[PDB]
Structures are given as structure tokens and as C-alpha cells.
Amino acid sequence: SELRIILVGKTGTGKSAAGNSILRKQAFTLTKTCSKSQGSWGNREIVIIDTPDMFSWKDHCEALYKEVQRCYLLSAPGPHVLLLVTQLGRYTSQDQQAAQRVKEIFGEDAMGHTIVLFTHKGSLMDYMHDSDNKALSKLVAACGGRICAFNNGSNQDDQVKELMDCIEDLLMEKNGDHYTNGLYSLIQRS
Amino acid sequence: SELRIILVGKTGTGKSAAGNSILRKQAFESTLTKTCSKSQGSWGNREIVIIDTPDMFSWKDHCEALYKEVQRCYLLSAPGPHVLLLVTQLGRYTSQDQQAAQRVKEIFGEDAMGHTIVLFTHSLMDYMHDSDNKALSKLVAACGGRICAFNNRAEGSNQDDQVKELMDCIEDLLMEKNGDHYTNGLYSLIQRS
């Protein structure tokens, strides 16, 4: 009864650190390859697939295509949730590019399983309300307003609980179904 | 002892028709090519396997379908191509052909040019010397001067001659490569998937 999470985001958002917080272990310099770590939270078995920083970059190369294939192989038969990790008050073209790559790598429908994570160091809804960023508003609306703040002990357990609550809410809405596409179906036959 | 050929090129270069000429059969539909196709034939004592790729490989953007077709291409051409035929139209090398060449490097790796032969669909050295396109010369130099002219409407004896001309280029490349096919980390990943 595993829960598969794909971490996506630009360099310096603390993507790997958020994965280590969820698994409560050192499960995961630039991230150059996909990594997979297994852990738990409560009664739940959690599988996290960390992706390279280059997923958020503009260009393409052999390594990118290879890592898209590993991501698919490591997250097969599909992710339950895609965590788009971004930094509070610092949503730039690089974050827009990372969001766009989620749609290009997994299909437009992947946004239906995406939660936007806001890393920093109620109060989040206060900043969103006054946000003058048209691109960020477009992303949050595309992710059905599924947003969660995250500061990267007790306070750490609380923000994981907050995020696990978002994830569970999405899962309940999806009746526990993971996201899938034609490439996942192709892997499943081969 | 099969010989694997991947066909790459922009829309309208007669990419599928060249594949059909090499195999001497209607192996591929020659509309847009939307998916990868594989057809087998023979030449001499060698089995020729041809992997036709979508026109979108020569396009600027990326999508789910492109990543799916990259995977099929890799699966159909595994453990790797001996040769990549970059099909271009003699007298019409544009930014779209430059993009197709660039995508060979992005899909298969920079070193892939080392296994690439430029096919000119339509004396060829005469049209080459008449050309003043700097981008095209840069591509031909990147492909070690491995160029070949092709008439996709050629039949019988003339058809056999242009395949022989191309098979000569391929054999020259193969000798240089010591019969080795081109490979990368993604072909290795597919092979163990």
C-alpha cells in the first residue's frame, strides 16, 4: 500500500531536504540523477523519487532523456503526488520552467496530482492574497489551490503532518489512485 | 550480424521513402510520421534493420508523446544504431534541418555525430561546391564528410546503385568504428529495463 511522491523543482529550493523531512532520515552540490528512497509516516509506506536540477533547466541532452526514463522506471506505475518545490516570495522563470517541465515530462494532467510546496526559514495565505505574481497564481490555480508552506523536532513533525494532510486530501479526492500516462503503460508491458 | 539504421530528419525530406529504397519494399508509409516504426530487410549477406522516427524529433518543443517516442526509438534500435541517417533535401538545408541535427545530439548524445551520415534526397560534389550554406558545411564537417545523394523515385538498376553508394559509406564508417554500433547510458538502461 505504498504512496509514491516525485520531487520536482529548481536548484536551491531544498527539494532533497523536504524529502529527508518527509521520510525523517538522510534519504537524499547539484542533483544530477534520480534517486529513490523508501520510508514511512504513520501507518503509511512512502516512496520518494528525487529528480535532477536539470529537469528545471531550459535545454535538453542525452542525460536528461536518460533521467526522464529512470524517473518513470523508479516511480512506475505512476506517482500519487508530484511535489513542486518552490521558495516563498522567490517564484522566478526558473520555477515557471520547472512547472512547465512537469507538464512536458508527465503530461498536462499531472498538475491534477501536483501540490506546490513553499520553502522558507495562514501566513502563507496572507502572502498568496497579496502576491502580484501572475505566473504563480496560474500555477496554484492549475494545482487546485493545493499549497503547503515548509521551513527547511516538534515543529518539523508538525509541518510534515501539515503536508501529509494535503497529500491525504488529494488522495481521498482521487480515491487513492495514482497518476498514469501512455509511457507508464509502455513500461508496464515491457 | 544485423545492421541497425535510425532515420532522422525534418518533415518533407522523404525520410520514409529513403528507408523503403534501402529495404527495396514499402516498409514505411510514404502525411506526418507520428510514431517510430521498425522494418527489416536485407542487402548482401547482411540483415538491415531500419528505425523510422517521428517528424516531431526535428521540432523545437517537448511533450509526453515525444518522451514516449524517444523510449520506443531506443527500444526498437537497442542495443544501438550502427548508423544514423540524417535525411535532408538536396538544395534545401534550413533552420529546421539544423534543429533536426541538433536533436540527434540531444536525443542520442554529442558523440552520435560520429555515427551520422548525411543523406541528400533529390554530381552531388558539384551541388556541394555550388552551395554557400555555412551551417550545412558545419554539419558535413561534424559528420566527417560522410555524405550521400539519393533519388527516392529511382527504380531497378539506378535504385541498386544508390543503395550500393550508401552501403559503401556505411561500410567505411563501420570499418572506422571496427564494426561497433553506437551506444550510450540510455541504451544500457533500456537493455536492463
Swiss-Prot record, chain B:
Instruction: List every stretch annotated G5.
Output: 151-153
Q: Annotated region G3: where?
A: 52-55
Question: What binding partners and quaternary form does the record give?
Answer: Monomer in the presence of bound GDP and in the absence of bound nucleotide. Homodimer in the presence of bound GTP. Can form linear oligomers. Heterodimer with GIMAP7.
Q: Name one GO cellular component term.
A: lipid droplet
Q: Which UniProt keywords apply?
A: GTP-binding, Lipid droplet, Nucleotide-binding
Q: Which gene encodes it?
A: GIMAP2
- Tissue expr: Detected in T-cells.
Q: Residue ranges of the AIG1-type G domain? A: 1-191
Q: Which domain of life is it from?
A: Eukaryota
Residues bound to GTP: T11, G12, T13, G14, K15, S16, A17, S30, L32, T33, N152
Per the record, the similarity remark reads:
Belongs to the TRAFAC class TrmE-Era-EngA-EngB-Septin-like GTPase superfamily. AIG1/Toc34/Toc159-like paraseptin GTPase family. IAN subfamily.
Which residue ranges are recorded for the region named G2?
A: 31-35
The main location is: other
Where is the segment annotated G1? Answer: 9-16
Compartment(s) where it occurs, according to its Swiss-Prot or TrEMBL record: Lipid droplet
Q: What is this protein called?
A: GTPase IMAP family member 2
Which terms does the record give in the GO molecular function aspect? GTP binding; identical protein binding
